[PDB]
Amino acid sequence: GMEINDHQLSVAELEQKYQTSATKGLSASLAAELLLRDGPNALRPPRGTPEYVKFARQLAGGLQCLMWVAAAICLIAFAIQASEGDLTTDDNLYLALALIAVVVVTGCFGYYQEFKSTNIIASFKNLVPQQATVIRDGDKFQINADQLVVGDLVEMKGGDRVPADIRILQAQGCKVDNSSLTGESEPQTRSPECTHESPLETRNIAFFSTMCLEGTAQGLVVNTGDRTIIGRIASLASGVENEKTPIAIEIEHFVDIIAGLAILFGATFFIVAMCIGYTFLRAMVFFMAIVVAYVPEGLLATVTVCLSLTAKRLASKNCVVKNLEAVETLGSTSVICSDKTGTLTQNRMTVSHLWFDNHIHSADTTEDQSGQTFDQSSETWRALCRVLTLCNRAAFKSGQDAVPVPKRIVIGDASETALLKFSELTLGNAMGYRERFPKVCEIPFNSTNKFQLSIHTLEDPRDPRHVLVMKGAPERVLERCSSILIKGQELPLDEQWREAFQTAYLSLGGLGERVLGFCQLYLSEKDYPPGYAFDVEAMNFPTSGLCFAGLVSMIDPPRATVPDAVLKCRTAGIRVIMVTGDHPITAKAIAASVGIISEGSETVEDIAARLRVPVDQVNRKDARACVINGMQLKDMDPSELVEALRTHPEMVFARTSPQQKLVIVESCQRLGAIVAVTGDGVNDSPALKKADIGVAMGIAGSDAAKNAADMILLDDNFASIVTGVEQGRLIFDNLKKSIAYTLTSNIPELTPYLIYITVSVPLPLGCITILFIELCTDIFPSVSLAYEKAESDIMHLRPRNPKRDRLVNEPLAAYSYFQIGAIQSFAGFTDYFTAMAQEGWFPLLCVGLRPQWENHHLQDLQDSYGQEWTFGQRLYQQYTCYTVFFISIEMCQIADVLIRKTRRLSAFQQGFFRNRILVIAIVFQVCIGCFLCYCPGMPNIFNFMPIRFQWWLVPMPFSLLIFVYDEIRKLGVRCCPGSWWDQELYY
Amino acid sequence: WVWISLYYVAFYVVMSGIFALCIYVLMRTIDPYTPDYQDQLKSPGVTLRPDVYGEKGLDISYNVSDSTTWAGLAHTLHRFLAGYSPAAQEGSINCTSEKYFFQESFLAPNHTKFSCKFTADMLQNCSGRPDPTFGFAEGKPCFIIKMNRIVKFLPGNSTAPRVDCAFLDQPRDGPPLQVEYFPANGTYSLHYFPYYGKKAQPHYSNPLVAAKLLNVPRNRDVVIVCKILAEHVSFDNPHDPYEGKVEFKLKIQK
Ligand SMILES: Cc1nc2c3c(ccn2c1C)[C@@H](O)[C@H](O)[C@H](c1ccccc1)N3
Ligand SMILES: *[C@@H]1O[C@H](CO)[C@@H](O)[C@H](O)[C@H]1NC(C)=O
Ligand SMILES: *[C@@H]1O[C@H](CO)[C@@H](O)[C@H](O)[C@H]1NC(C)=O
Ligand SMILES: [Mg+2]
Ligand SMILES: [Rb+]
Ligand SMILES: [Rb+]
Ligand SMILES: [Rb+]
Ligand SMILES: [Rb+]
């Protein structure tokens, strides 16, 4: 926009430029034309988001890619088998079809979650159109903000949100709330003098979204809409493209192993196919069945429910997440960049400390009033509380008696609201209390006096004397004080106290707190009888020799849970940095307050002042902390930044632009960090997008920063973050527990094929039957592994190294595929030969027998028993071969699901029945297993039939062998974790 | 890096041996004469010779005037019947009991039992003599209809089981067909049942009958269903069409 040289112009120059009047405002006609020219004074949302392209994305990436390829291969195989002629190849279709179906349905489940969460977030939104008091043709009236046009004339006051970007023309004690654009937690003086050349730092521009605290100003609208400082800062954040989530990156690497193995097996057994005497055509269709057999059919569905479960558990703590992948990120996270104002602090002036009875008292600045409050038994307390309750012009909006006292809306301003919310908390019912003491004279914030003074008749009629109350800048109260309430008496304001007051004023100011002096004088009912007319102009009342009551100082206090939460994260090994736009003194204050900076750490500037040495000589390595302001951040190149970044562990950036915030996250990510940013304002939108997870404050958050966030704390409870880590850490461990289970069953599915390929035995396992394994029986058990409790103290571990610690590592698979898969293959093959040897066919006979077996012409083929059956009668046996191999898997899966409960612990310790949801799932597993076999009509529908009751028992020793063998593994890894066992045999 | 390699070997051979033990268990488990379960043998199937298959099942179509079309049909009938010759079937005994034949004990070299005998003789004209075209050159083909063997399966003391062949529809279209089977009335004698083993009766052969088709029109597609008739036979199973009945298409051209 044209913002660079708006404020530096003259008012004679501006009204030529925008063809307006600084007095009379924009003509009604032109202001209407302009709106057409420039469009509405609002911000265009990220359009171009059809409902049908939201779903298209849900079915891409990772397993999505693999499963589509795997599905496509099934169709090419059907073409090759329909070229040379293959019957009941219905299997090729059903497989390819079930692949695409899992992909689609997973995509829909994700769609509702992303849809459902966004409606939850939408309902915590305000839909009342902000208004603007405008002047057009010399008439002031109320209009909607969006209707303002560049050149308009506007006004605002206490409580008015700033309608546009306004060049200030004339301001009467106007201060305003830049906490969203800049970090600034102290209100900002607005005047028409040109404070600076950067529109960001000059004090004659009200910014587009900002909030007037007190006073009044007028000005010209200079940029409306997307052209504002708000406007161009979110154009920025659009231009920020966020990186792929950690959880997704794990799953993509995971696929490079499935794919990696697929092909090697394909190639070797395609080589074995050619070498053993097959046509290239059939060697290649086998090659294809091999790669496709490595793709897990259900892993995509089993994974995303696990995410949905924790996201549900997280939703329940007012931590609503937008996409399912972000549920894991916090557990992976190792750095947290954090905004100060609004996120860490409450952004609301609270009374922090008070000086009376020659002692400073610390108030309870928690919003839930969970902190420690101060000594209110003092006689001087009751009095200082009267002065600050009477001499307060502000008021609560009506009908908020339900809502908590800090969260109430209050008219007026914060110097005075903090005093009002304070009184309601400490005294209670302040505005009704001060109706007992009527008001006869008043002086608001004055020029010549520079103090606020009012006179009141007492409550009870037995006391006809009047009471004068004065508040104001602390020295300007003391100069008009000859007395001081101390410890039950009213002492003269001698040099002991004059020194003692100045030390306390400068003491509470050193914390950068807006502090005010308070005092009272009791007018005698002799000189001032009931009804004495007071004159403001002439000085008939006294404004001197008053009795000093005390000091009260207010500040921007941290949110209640915040100091606790930061510590709990650091013990999780998560580096906390603070990136804020506020000034350093405030920045270091809060960073001490909450935990970013620990008791005892000093910056290089601290050593230089304690040792009284120039900063250059100080060894930076000796500084556990450091502050860096933004105006000096740019001076260092990135090689300088990393130096300092890894020198001082308790880092704080102060006075930093949104882009700098982005730079920092980028510099951290560039050094291999899973970095999370935690934000409220529009100076975090860009920062929040680039972060691996962007956390928004549910209530205090600006729209952009919520819109650029992965996660949202609906109640602003920052303690949610610490749970987010714990859950994210949990499922990562529980996912690799649950993944490692589901992919063991691939090998005993493929071994039947490989053997049917190589040894040419009659087909032991059918496609229609692996689909029931992968997509019917083993899902409920798999997802139940998301219910396991932490085996170790997860919250005490360092954040997993993304380079070494991986969801699926080279010992994870090699254990699950080749070792337990082998015990399952031998379990399946042992029941395979038993099935046929007991049914007439001896094993030696089965070797090579397949061609005649599948042959549709041989209707009298002899067993090893001499007997001759037909095709269909053989088929029905092969269905049992399928069916007995199927239950041979299931009896190992029940042994398998329990095996995965703990990677490094034992079930005699933890409990076989530890969690309910796995056990209820195991019972489900067998139930369909018994329904699939002994339901009538099963053999024709699916290749399943009533097994004999003893073939159930055949694989049950192998299940025990699985039990024993891992139990001793995970009994030997934990109890002797020297080197060998943990390396090859830990997953 | 080598140390890991051995481990997979140790692991596999353990499982290998563990599996190598179960095979040895399973071979000693199972009987060598009587089927361990035989769960799909509630009713037997019926094969047909000559077995010449079309796109779906058995289709047999030849030209009488053209020796080539039907030569290969007898050139499978004759081949099949080489074991139905006395020269290679002398390793058993003649059974004229005309009733079921139960051997409780094994009496032949290497602890074996006695088998019945059946030679082309029984199929009078359809034996290769006097007609080596087995009816085909005449336009009256003979089809051999043999049932599969099931250890200790019994079709019934009542009478002999017997084949019956006919078409599917075409009642009014032409005459119902007449076949003369050999043996007459188309019956398998009772003394052949039951089967007892490939090791129990090595020199054993299935009894069969033949079907000399008389009625079949020339140059017309017909369909015939040779279905066995006994009590312990079910020729009505829709999942296995070749179960106690065999269908075949047959067109004889001139
Ligand atoms: C692991 C496994 N794979 C199959 C399989 C079939 C039967 C059993 N199978 C088993 C136990 C056939 O019906 C199919 O041709 C099918 C196939 C799939 C992709 C490419 C080529 C062929 N592959
Ligand atoms: C049968 O064969 C003879 C000689 O091969 C031929 O002349 C006659 O037309 C054939 N009949 C049919 C229907 O093809
Ligand atoms: C079979 O041959 C005999 C003599 O060899 C003859 O009497 C009889 O009619 C023939 N059967 C048929 C069906 O032609
Ligand atoms: Mg902020
Ligand atoms: Rb698979
Ligand atoms: Rb206190
Ligand atoms: Rb993000
Ligand atoms: Rb019957």
Short mmCIF file of N, CA, C and O in Angstrom, two decimals, chain B residues 165-245:
data_model
loop_
_atom_site.label_atom_id
_atom_site.label_comp_id
_atom_site.label_asym_id
_atom_site.label_seq_id
_atom_site.Cartn_x
_atom_site.Cartn_y
_atom_site.Cartn_z
N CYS B 165 -28.58 -92.51 -18.82
CA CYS B 165 -28.20 -91.38 -19.64
C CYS B 165 -29.41 -90.91 -20.43
O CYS B 165 -30.25 -91.73 -20.83
N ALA B 166 -29.51 -89.60 -20.64
CA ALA B 166 -30.61 -89.00 -21.39
C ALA B 166 -30.25 -87.56 -21.71
O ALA B 166 -29.15 -87.10 -21.37
N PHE B 167 -31.17 -86.84 -22.35
CA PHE B 167 -30.96 -85.43 -22.64
C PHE B 167 -31.49 -84.51 -21.53
O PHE B 167 -31.74 -84.92 -20.39
N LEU B 168 -31.62 -83.23 -21.84
CA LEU B 168 -31.99 -82.24 -20.85
C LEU B 168 -33.44 -81.82 -20.98
O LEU B 168 -34.21 -81.82 -20.01
N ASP B 169 -33.83 -81.47 -22.20
CA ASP B 169 -35.18 -81.18 -22.65
C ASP B 169 -35.22 -81.83 -24.01
O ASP B 169 -34.58 -82.87 -24.20
N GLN B 170 -36.00 -81.27 -24.94
CA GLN B 170 -36.31 -81.83 -26.26
C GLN B 170 -37.20 -83.06 -26.14
O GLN B 170 -36.88 -84.10 -26.74
N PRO B 171 -38.34 -83.02 -25.38
CA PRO B 171 -39.23 -84.19 -25.34
C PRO B 171 -39.98 -84.41 -26.65
O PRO B 171 -39.98 -85.51 -27.24
N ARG B 172 -40.63 -83.35 -27.10
CA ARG B 172 -41.40 -83.38 -28.34
C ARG B 172 -40.50 -83.32 -29.57
O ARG B 172 -40.88 -83.82 -30.64
N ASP B 173 -39.31 -82.71 -29.43
CA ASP B 173 -38.42 -82.47 -30.57
C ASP B 173 -38.13 -83.77 -31.31
O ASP B 173 -38.14 -83.80 -32.55
N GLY B 174 -37.88 -84.83 -30.58
CA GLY B 174 -37.63 -86.12 -31.16
C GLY B 174 -37.76 -87.22 -30.13
O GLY B 174 -38.28 -87.03 -29.02
N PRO B 175 -37.28 -88.40 -30.50
CA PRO B 175 -37.45 -89.56 -29.62
C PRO B 175 -36.61 -89.44 -28.41
O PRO B 175 -35.47 -88.90 -28.43
N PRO B 176 -37.06 -89.92 -27.25
CA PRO B 176 -36.17 -90.10 -26.10
C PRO B 176 -35.08 -91.09 -26.47
O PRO B 176 -35.31 -92.02 -27.24
N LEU B 177 -33.88 -90.88 -25.94
CA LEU B 177 -32.77 -91.69 -26.45
C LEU B 177 -32.76 -93.09 -25.85
O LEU B 177 -33.21 -93.32 -24.72
N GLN B 178 -32.21 -94.02 -26.62
CA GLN B 178 -31.99 -95.37 -26.15
C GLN B 178 -30.50 -95.65 -26.20
O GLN B 178 -29.83 -95.37 -27.20
N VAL B 179 -30.00 -96.16 -25.09
CA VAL B 179 -28.62 -96.58 -24.97
C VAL B 179 -28.64 -98.04 -24.59
O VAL B 179 -29.50 -98.48 -23.82
N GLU B 180 -27.70 -98.81 -25.13
CA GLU B 180 -27.41 -100.12 -24.57
C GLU B 180 -26.08 -100.06 -23.86
O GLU B 180 -25.05 -99.82 -24.50
N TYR B 181 -26.09 -100.24 -22.54
CA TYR B 181 -24.86 -100.23 -21.76
C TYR B 181 -24.31 -101.65 -21.64
O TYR B 181 -25.04 -102.63 -21.73
N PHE B 182 -23.00 -101.73 -21.44
CA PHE B 182 -22.30 -103.01 -21.31
C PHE B 182 -21.39 -102.97 -20.09
O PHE B 182 -20.40 -102.21 -20.10
N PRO B 183 -21.66 -103.74 -19.03
CA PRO B 183 -22.70 -104.77 -18.83
C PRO B 183 -24.15 -104.32 -18.94
O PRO B 183 -24.46 -103.15 -18.79
N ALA B 184 -25.03 -105.26 -19.23
CA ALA B 184 -26.43 -104.93 -19.47
C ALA B 184 -27.10 -104.47 -18.18
O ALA B 184 -26.69 -104.83 -17.07
N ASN B 185 -28.15 -103.67 -18.36
CA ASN B 185 -28.78 -102.88 -17.33
C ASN B 185 -27.80 -101.84 -16.77
O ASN B 185 -28.18 -101.06 -15.89
N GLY B 186 -26.57 -101.79 -17.27
CA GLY B 186 -25.59 -100.75 -16.92
C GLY B 186 -25.14 -100.75 -15.48
O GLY B 186 -24.97 -99.67 -14.90
N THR B 187 -24.91 -101.92 -14.90
CA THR B 187 -24.72 -102.03 -13.46
C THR B 187 -23.28 -102.40 -13.13
O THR B 187 -22.69 -103.30 -13.74
N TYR B 188 -22.71 -101.70 -12.15
CA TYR B 188 -21.44 -102.09 -11.56
C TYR B 188 -21.70 -103.14 -10.48
O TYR B 188 -22.53 -102.93 -9.59
N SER B 189 -20.98 -104.25 -10.54
CA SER B 189 -21.22 -105.31 -9.56
C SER B 189 -20.83 -104.86 -8.16
O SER B 189 -19.97 -104.00 -7.97
N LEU B 190 -21.48 -105.47 -7.17
CA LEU B 190 -21.36 -105.01 -5.80
C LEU B 190 -20.01 -105.39 -5.19
O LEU B 190 -19.53 -104.70 -4.29
N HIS B 191 -19.39 -106.47 -5.68
CA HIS B 191 -18.21 -107.02 -5.02
C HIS B 191 -16.97 -106.16 -5.21
O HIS B 191 -15.92 -106.47 -4.64
N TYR B 192 -17.05 -105.08 -5.97
CA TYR B 192 -15.90 -104.20 -6.14
C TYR B 192 -15.72 -103.25 -4.95
O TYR B 192 -14.62 -102.76 -4.71
N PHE B 193 -16.80 -102.95 -4.24
CA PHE B 193 -16.76 -102.04 -3.10
C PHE B 193 -16.46 -102.80 -1.82
O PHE B 193 -16.85 -103.96 -1.68
N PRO B 194 -15.75 -102.16 -0.88
CA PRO B 194 -15.19 -100.80 -0.96
C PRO B 194 -13.69 -100.68 -1.32
O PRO B 194 -12.97 -101.69 -1.32
N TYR B 195 -13.22 -99.48 -1.65
CA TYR B 195 -11.79 -99.29 -1.83
C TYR B 195 -11.11 -99.41 -0.47
O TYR B 195 -11.72 -99.16 0.57
N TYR B 196 -9.85 -99.85 -0.46
CA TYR B 196 -9.15 -99.93 0.82
C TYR B 196 -7.78 -99.27 0.86
O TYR B 196 -7.29 -99.00 1.96
N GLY B 197 -7.16 -99.00 -0.27
CA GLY B 197 -5.89 -98.31 -0.22
C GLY B 197 -5.17 -98.39 -1.54
O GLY B 197 -5.43 -99.29 -2.32
N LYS B 198 -4.34 -97.40 -1.86
CA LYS B 198 -3.34 -97.62 -2.91
C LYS B 198 -2.30 -98.61 -2.42
O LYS B 198 -1.79 -99.42 -3.20
N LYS B 199 -1.98 -98.57 -1.13
CA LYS B 199 -1.08 -99.56 -0.57
C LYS B 199 -1.82 -100.82 -0.15
O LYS B 199 -1.24 -101.91 -0.15
N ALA B 200 -3.12 -100.70 0.16
CA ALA B 200 -3.90 -101.88 0.57
C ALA B 200 -4.16 -102.82 -0.61
O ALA B 200 -4.10 -104.04 -0.44
N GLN B 201 -4.47 -102.30 -1.80
CA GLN B 201 -4.78 -103.13 -2.97
C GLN B 201 -4.12 -102.53 -4.20
O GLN B 201 -4.80 -102.04 -5.11
N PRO B 202 -2.79 -102.60 -4.29
CA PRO B 202 -2.08 -101.94 -5.41
C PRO B 202 -2.59 -102.32 -6.80
O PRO B 202 -2.70 -101.45 -7.68
N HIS B 203 -2.90 -103.59 -7.03
CA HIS B 203 -3.36 -104.04 -8.34
C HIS B 203 -4.88 -104.08 -8.37
O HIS B 203 -5.52 -105.12 -8.48
N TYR B 204 -5.46 -102.89 -8.30
CA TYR B 204 -6.90 -102.73 -8.31
C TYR B 204 -7.32 -101.75 -9.39
O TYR B 204 -6.56 -100.85 -9.75
N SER B 205 -8.53 -101.94 -9.91
CA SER B 205 -9.04 -101.04 -10.94
C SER B 205 -10.54 -100.84 -10.79
O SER B 205 -11.29 -101.76 -10.47
N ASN B 206 -10.97 -99.61 -11.10
CA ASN B 206 -12.37 -99.24 -10.95
C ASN B 206 -13.24 -100.04 -11.92
O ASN B 206 -12.88 -100.19 -13.10
N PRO B 207 -14.36 -100.60 -11.47
CA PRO B 207 -15.39 -101.07 -12.40
C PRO B 207 -16.01 -99.93 -13.19
O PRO B 207 -16.23 -98.83 -12.67
N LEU B 208 -16.35 -100.22 -14.45
CA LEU B 208 -16.99 -99.23 -15.30
C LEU B 208 -18.05 -99.89 -16.16
O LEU B 208 -18.17 -101.11 -16.21
N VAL B 209 -18.87 -99.04 -16.79
CA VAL B 209 -19.81 -99.46 -17.82
C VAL B 209 -19.61 -98.53 -19.01
O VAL B 209 -18.95 -97.49 -18.91
N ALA B 210 -20.19 -98.92 -20.14
CA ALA B 210 -20.12 -98.14 -21.37
C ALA B 210 -21.54 -97.77 -21.79
O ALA B 210 -22.51 -98.41 -21.40
N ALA B 211 -21.65 -96.71 -22.60
CA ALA B 211 -22.96 -96.25 -23.07
C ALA B 211 -22.94 -96.16 -24.60
O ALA B 211 -22.42 -95.19 -25.14
N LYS B 212 -23.54 -97.13 -25.30
CA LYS B 212 -23.60 -97.05 -26.76
C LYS B 212 -24.82 -96.23 -27.17
O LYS B 212 -25.96 -96.69 -27.03
N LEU B 213 -24.58 -95.05 -27.71
CA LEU B 213 -25.68 -94.15 -28.05
C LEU B 213 -26.31 -94.53 -29.39
O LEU B 213 -25.66 -94.47 -30.44
N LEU B 214 -27.60 -94.84 -29.37
CA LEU B 214 -28.29 -95.24 -30.59
C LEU B 214 -29.09 -94.12 -31.22
O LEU B 214 -29.05 -93.95 -32.44
N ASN B 215 -29.80 -93.33 -30.41
CA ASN B 215 -30.86 -92.48 -30.95
C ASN B 215 -30.34 -91.20 -31.59
O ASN B 215 -31.02 -90.68 -32.48
N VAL B 216 -29.19 -90.70 -31.15
CA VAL B 216 -28.68 -89.34 -31.43
C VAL B 216 -28.74 -88.93 -32.90
O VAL B 216 -28.18 -89.60 -33.78
N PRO B 217 -29.41 -87.84 -33.22
CA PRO B 217 -29.51 -87.45 -34.63
C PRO B 217 -28.17 -86.95 -35.15
O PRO B 217 -27.31 -86.45 -34.42
N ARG B 218 -28.02 -87.11 -36.46
CA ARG B 218 -26.83 -86.64 -37.14
C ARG B 218 -26.91 -85.14 -37.34
O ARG B 218 -27.99 -84.60 -37.61
N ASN B 219 -25.77 -84.47 -37.22
CA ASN B 219 -25.65 -83.05 -37.52
C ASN B 219 -26.48 -82.17 -36.59
O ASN B 219 -26.85 -81.05 -36.94
N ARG B 220 -26.78 -82.65 -35.39
CA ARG B 220 -27.52 -81.84 -34.43
C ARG B 220 -26.80 -81.84 -33.10
O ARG B 220 -26.47 -82.90 -32.56
N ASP B 221 -26.62 -80.64 -32.55
CA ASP B 221 -26.13 -80.47 -31.19
C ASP B 221 -27.14 -81.04 -30.22
O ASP B 221 -28.29 -80.62 -30.20
N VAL B 222 -26.70 -81.97 -29.37
CA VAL B 222 -27.54 -82.48 -28.30
C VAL B 222 -26.74 -82.38 -27.01
O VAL B 222 -25.57 -81.99 -27.01
N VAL B 223 -27.40 -82.67 -25.88
CA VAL B 223 -26.72 -82.72 -24.58
C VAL B 223 -27.22 -83.90 -23.79
O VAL B 223 -28.43 -84.09 -23.65
N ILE B 224 -26.28 -84.65 -23.18
CA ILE B 224 -26.56 -85.91 -22.50
C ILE B 224 -26.01 -85.87 -21.09
O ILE B 224 -24.95 -85.29 -20.84
N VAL B 225 -26.74 -86.50 -20.16
CA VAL B 225 -26.38 -86.48 -18.74
C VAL B 225 -26.44 -87.91 -18.21
O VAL B 225 -27.51 -88.40 -17.83
N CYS B 226 -25.28 -88.57 -18.17
CA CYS B 226 -25.11 -89.91 -17.59
C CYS B 226 -25.02 -89.86 -16.08
O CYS B 226 -23.93 -89.71 -15.51
N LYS B 227 -26.14 -90.08 -15.41
CA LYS B 227 -26.25 -89.96 -13.96
C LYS B 227 -26.39 -91.33 -13.32
O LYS B 227 -27.22 -92.14 -13.74
N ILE B 228 -25.60 -91.58 -12.27
CA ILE B 228 -25.66 -92.84 -11.53
C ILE B 228 -26.94 -92.90 -10.71
O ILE B 228 -27.49 -91.87 -10.28
N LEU B 229 -27.42 -94.12 -10.46
CA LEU B 229 -28.65 -94.33 -9.70
C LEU B 229 -28.36 -95.30 -8.56
O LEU B 229 -28.18 -96.50 -8.79
N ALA B 230 -28.31 -94.77 -7.35
CA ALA B 230 -28.13 -95.57 -6.14
C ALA B 230 -28.69 -94.75 -4.97
O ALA B 230 -29.10 -93.60 -5.14
N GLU B 231 -28.70 -95.36 -3.78
CA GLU B 231 -29.24 -94.65 -2.62
C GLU B 231 -28.22 -93.70 -2.01
O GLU B 231 -28.55 -92.55 -1.71
N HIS B 232 -26.98 -94.16 -1.84
CA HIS B 232 -25.89 -93.37 -1.28
C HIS B 232 -25.18 -92.54 -2.35
O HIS B 232 -23.97 -92.29 -2.24
N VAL B 233 -25.90 -92.16 -3.41
CA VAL B 233 -25.42 -91.22 -4.41
C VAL B 233 -26.35 -90.01 -4.43
O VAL B 233 -27.57 -90.16 -4.30
N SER B 234 -25.76 -88.83 -4.57
CA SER B 234 -26.52 -87.59 -4.74
C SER B 234 -26.02 -86.91 -6.01
O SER B 234 -24.88 -86.42 -6.05
N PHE B 235 -26.86 -86.89 -7.04
CA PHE B 235 -26.53 -86.26 -8.31
C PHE B 235 -27.23 -84.91 -8.48
O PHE B 235 -27.50 -84.47 -9.60
N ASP B 236 -27.49 -84.23 -7.37
CA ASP B 236 -28.28 -83.00 -7.36
C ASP B 236 -27.51 -81.83 -6.76
O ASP B 236 -28.10 -80.78 -6.51
N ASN B 237 -26.21 -81.99 -6.52
CA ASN B 237 -25.41 -80.91 -5.94
C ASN B 237 -25.13 -79.83 -6.99
O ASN B 237 -24.52 -80.12 -8.02
N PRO B 238 -25.54 -78.58 -6.75
CA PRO B 238 -25.30 -77.53 -7.74
C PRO B 238 -23.88 -76.95 -7.72
O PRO B 238 -23.51 -76.24 -8.67
N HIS B 239 -23.10 -77.21 -6.67
CA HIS B 239 -21.73 -76.70 -6.62
C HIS B 239 -20.75 -77.59 -7.36
O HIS B 239 -19.76 -77.07 -7.90
N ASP B 240 -20.98 -78.89 -7.37
CA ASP B 240 -20.13 -79.85 -8.10
C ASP B 240 -20.96 -80.55 -9.16
O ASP B 240 -21.70 -81.50 -8.86
N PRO B 241 -20.90 -80.10 -10.42
CA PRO B 241 -21.76 -80.69 -11.46
C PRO B 241 -21.42 -82.12 -11.78
O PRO B 241 -22.30 -82.85 -12.25
N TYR B 242 -20.17 -82.52 -11.58
CA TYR B 242 -19.65 -83.85 -11.86
C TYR B 242 -19.73 -84.71 -10.61
O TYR B 242 -18.74 -85.31 -10.21
N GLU B 243 -20.89 -84.77 -9.97
CA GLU B 243 -21.06 -85.44 -8.67
C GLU B 243 -22.16 -86.49 -8.81
O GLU B 243 -23.34 -86.20 -8.63
N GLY B 244 -21.78 -87.72 -9.13
CA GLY B 244 -22.80 -88.71 -9.38
C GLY B 244 -23.51 -88.58 -10.71
O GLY B 244 -24.38 -89.41 -11.00
N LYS B 245 -23.17 -87.58 -11.53
CA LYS B 245 -23.72 -87.37 -12.87
C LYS B 245 -22.63 -86.71 -13.69
O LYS B 245 -21.82 -85.97 -13.14
#
